[PDB]
Write an enzyme that holds these catalytic residues in place. Structure first.
Site, PDB file in Angstrom:
ATOM      1  N   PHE A  27       0.750  -1.203   0.032  1.00 38.70           N
ATOM      2  CA  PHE A  27       0.005   0.094   0.126  1.00 38.70           C
ATOM      3  C   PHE A  27       0.709   1.084  -0.012  1.00 38.70           C
ATOM      4  O   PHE A  27       0.321   2.490  -0.396  1.00 38.70           O
ATOM      5  N   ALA A  28       2.088   1.186   0.389  1.00 40.33           N
ATOM      6  CA  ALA A  28       2.974   2.293   0.700  1.00 40.33           C
ATOM      7  C   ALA A  28       3.667   2.691  -0.642  1.00 40.33           C
ATOM      8  O   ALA A  28       4.109   1.596  -1.484  1.00 40.33           O
ATOM      9  CB  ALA A  28       3.909   2.084   1.761  1.00 40.33           C
ATOM     10  N   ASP A 139      11.091 -12.077   9.856  1.00 37.53           N
ATOM     11  CA  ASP A 139      10.743 -12.083   8.728  1.00 37.53           C
ATOM     12  C   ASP A 139      12.276 -11.503   8.109  1.00 37.53           C
ATOM     13  O   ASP A 139      12.256 -10.419   7.249  1.00 37.53           O
ATOM     14  CB  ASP A 139       9.583 -11.201   8.394  1.00 37.53           C
ATOM     15  CG  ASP A 139       9.512 -11.162   6.713  1.00 37.53           C
ATOM     16  OD1 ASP A 139       9.529 -12.127   6.110  1.00 37.53           O
ATOM     17  OD2 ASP A 139       8.841 -10.242   6.299  1.00 37.53           O
ATOM     18  N   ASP A 157      12.300  -3.643   7.755  1.00 33.77           N
ATOM     19  CA  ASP A 157      11.085  -4.101   7.765  1.00 33.77           C
ATOM     20  C   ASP A 157      10.545  -5.086   8.805  1.00 33.77           C
ATOM     21  O   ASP A 157      10.876  -6.137   8.794  1.00 33.77           O
ATOM     22  CB  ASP A 157      10.921  -4.636   6.234  1.00 33.77           C
ATOM     23  CG  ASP A 157       9.658  -5.587   6.029  1.00 33.77           C
ATOM     24  OD1 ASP A 157       8.547  -5.270   6.658  1.00 33.77           O
ATOM     25  OD2 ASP A 157       9.823  -6.879   5.222  1.00 33.77           O
TER      26      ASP A 157
HETATM   27  C1  LIG Z   1       3.199   0.642   5.281  1.00 35.27           C
HETATM   28  C2  LIG Z   1       4.579   0.485   6.261  1.00 35.27           C
HETATM   29  C3  LIG Z   1       5.763  -0.115   6.152  1.00 35.27           C
HETATM   30  C4  LIG Z   1       6.404   0.334   7.533  1.00 35.27           C
HETATM   31  N1  LIG Z   1       7.505  -0.150   7.784  1.00 35.27           N
HETATM   32  C5  LIG Z   1       8.782   0.233   7.004  1.00 35.27           C
HETATM   33  O1  LIG Z   1       8.784   0.857   5.996  1.00 35.27           O
HETATM   34  N2  LIG Z   1       9.922  -0.317   7.432  1.00 35.27           N
HETATM   35  C6  LIG Z   1      10.975  -0.121   6.724  1.00 35.27           C
HETATM   36  N3  LIG Z   1      12.041  -0.591   7.292  1.00 35.27           N
HETATM   37  C7  LIG Z   1      13.281  -0.404   6.478  1.00 35.27           C
HETATM   38  C8  LIG Z   1      12.921   0.327   5.391  1.00 35.27           C
HETATM   39  C9  LIG Z   1      13.935   0.878   4.328  1.00 35.27           C
HETATM   40  C10 LIG Z   1      13.354   2.230   3.941  1.00 35.27           C
HETATM   41  N4  LIG Z   1      14.698   2.934   3.508  1.00 35.27           N
HETATM   42  C11 LIG Z   1      14.841   2.992   1.858  1.00 35.27           C
HETATM   43  C12 LIG Z   1      13.690   2.552   1.044  1.00 35.27           C
HETATM   44  C13 LIG Z   1      13.815   2.806  -0.400  1.00 35.27           C
HETATM   45  N5  LIG Z   1      13.105   2.146  -1.248  1.00 35.27           N
HETATM   46  C14 LIG Z   1      12.011   1.708  -1.010  1.00 35.27           C
HETATM   47  N6  LIG Z   1      11.613   1.070   0.119  1.00 35.27           N
HETATM   48  C15 LIG Z   1      10.478   0.348  -0.203  1.00 35.27           C
HETATM   49  N7  LIG Z   1      10.012   0.680  -1.548  1.00 35.27           N
HETATM   50  N8  LIG Z   1      11.075   1.405  -2.090  1.00 35.27           N
HETATM   51  N9  LIG Z   1      15.165   3.569  -0.664  1.00 35.27           N
HETATM   52  C16 LIG Z   1      15.677   4.168   0.303  1.00 35.27           C
HETATM   53  N10 LIG Z   1      15.896   3.793   1.468  1.00 35.27           N
HETATM   54  S1  LIG Z   1      11.269   0.893   5.365  1.00 35.27           S
HETATM   55  C17 LIG Z   1       5.440   0.937   8.229  1.00 35.27           C
HETATM   56  C18 LIG Z   1       5.473   1.354   9.615  1.00 35.27           C
HETATM   57  F1  LIG Z   1       6.594   2.109  10.122  1.00 35.27           F
HETATM   58  F2  LIG Z   1       4.526   2.471   9.687  1.00 35.27           F
HETATM   59  F3  LIG Z   1       5.204   0.641  10.442  1.00 35.27           F
HETATM   60  O2  LIG Z   1       4.246   0.963   7.492  1.00 35.27           O
END
Ligand SMILES: Cc1cc(NC(=O)/N=c2/[nH]cc(CCNc3cc(Nc4nc[nH]n4)ncn3)s2)c(C(F)(F)F)o1
Length: 287
Positions: A27-28, A139, A157
């Site tokens: 969704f993100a 995970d 993640d």
């Molecule tokens: C819907 C959602 C997901 C989520 N968690 C979350 O994103 N977790 C992460 N852990 C590590 C991540 C590394 C992001 N950094 C990046 C990412 C990137 N490109 C990229 N990432 C996804 N798509 N394209 N390019 C450069 N840097 S994102 C949450 C929360 F936080 F609310 F719980 O909600």
């Protein structure tokens, strides 16, 4: 529902400029966001509120945020705060410009042994931090092992991550499907920290061999392989590396190595282990 060019947060009142599209997932939709005041760059995830309609879904996110927020380690993706408006929930994260280890894997296939030592060592160091803070990731996969400009592994993640509060606690309920699931989780047997070691076993295998140990076209078959513990490390692989993998993928969760025990393994101590890797490793083996 158009995403605003400037992202202000009601609390801390920092104005974030939305820049180049970095990628999407579920969704993100992620973007490179710059703090307009300091010029500091972050990864901003913009998720529509129509995706978090169920209070069940908003529960998984608020649990995830709490676990991620508390983390501070140079091998875990930073969580620099979350906020929302009447349309989107904004999450500010550490920037990882070099995609994930998955993209590296698909371009490289089987990587050289010294590279596996580098990638696994940094990944384990991150997992140790998590475990010492009573966090199970649950995970771990190539797509969650992010790389920055310095080719540093950053675990991210935490959508399936959980915290344990007392000694010997065994988790039973898992809301979601991991990529490399440990056998004890498939059989609802009750699980703890050792499922992360299992995943790491798959990860090392995948890096060294070029393909997942329980890879199949059919999903139903894949689960059978896991339950029965059916896999074979090709004879080509280093005895020492194949030894480690077999222990890491032990059917008995208690006979698997602990996180602390991985770092001191012969696999990390005997062969050549580089401290830095060039960005060329994304495409070609290091000369
Ligand atoms: C819907 C959602 C997901 C989520 N968690 C979350 O994103 N977790 C992460 N852990 C590590 C991540 C590394 C992001 N950094 C990046 C990412 C990137 N490109 C990229 N990432 C996804 N798509 N394209 N390019 C450069 N840097 S994102 C949450 C929360 F936080 F609310 F719980 O909600």
């Amino acid at each position: 529902k158009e995403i605003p060019d400037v992202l202000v947060d009601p609390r801390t009142m920092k104005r974030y400029m939305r820049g180049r599209f970095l990628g999407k997932g579920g969704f993100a939709k992620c973007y490179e966001i710059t703090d307009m005041d300091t010029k500091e760059v972050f990864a901003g995830k913009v998720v529509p509120k129509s995706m978090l309609l169920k209070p069940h879904q908003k529960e998984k996110m608020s649990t995830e945020i709490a676990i991620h927020k508390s983390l501070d380690n140079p091998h875990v993706v930073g969580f620099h705060g979350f906020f929302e408006d009447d349309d989107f929930v904004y999450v500010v994260l550490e920037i990882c410009r070099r995609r994930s280890l998955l993209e590296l894997h698909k371009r490289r296939k089987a990587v050289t042994e010294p590279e596996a030592r580098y990638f696994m060592r940094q990944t384990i160091q991150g997992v140790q931090y998590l475990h010492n803070n009573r966090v199970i990731h649950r995970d771990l996969k190539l797509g969650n092992l992010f790389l920055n400009d310095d080719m540093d592994v950053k675990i991210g993640d935490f959508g399936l991550a959980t915290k344990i509060e007392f000694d010997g606690e065994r988790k039973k309920d898992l809301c979601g499907t991991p990529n490399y699931i440990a056998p004890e989780v498939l059989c609802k047997k009750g699980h703890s920290f050792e499922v992360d070691i299992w995943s790491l076993g798959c990860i090392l295998y995948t890096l060294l061999v070029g393909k997942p140990p329980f890879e199949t076209s059919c999903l139903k078959e894949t689960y059978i392989r896991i339950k029965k513990n059916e896999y074979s490390v090709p004879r080509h692989i280093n005895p020492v590396a194949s030894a480690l993998i077999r222990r890491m993928l032990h059917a008995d969760p208690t006979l698997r190595p602990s996180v602390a025990e991985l770092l001191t393994d012969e696999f990390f101590t005997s062969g050549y282990a580089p401290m830095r890797l060039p960005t060329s490793c994304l495409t070609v083996p290091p000369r």
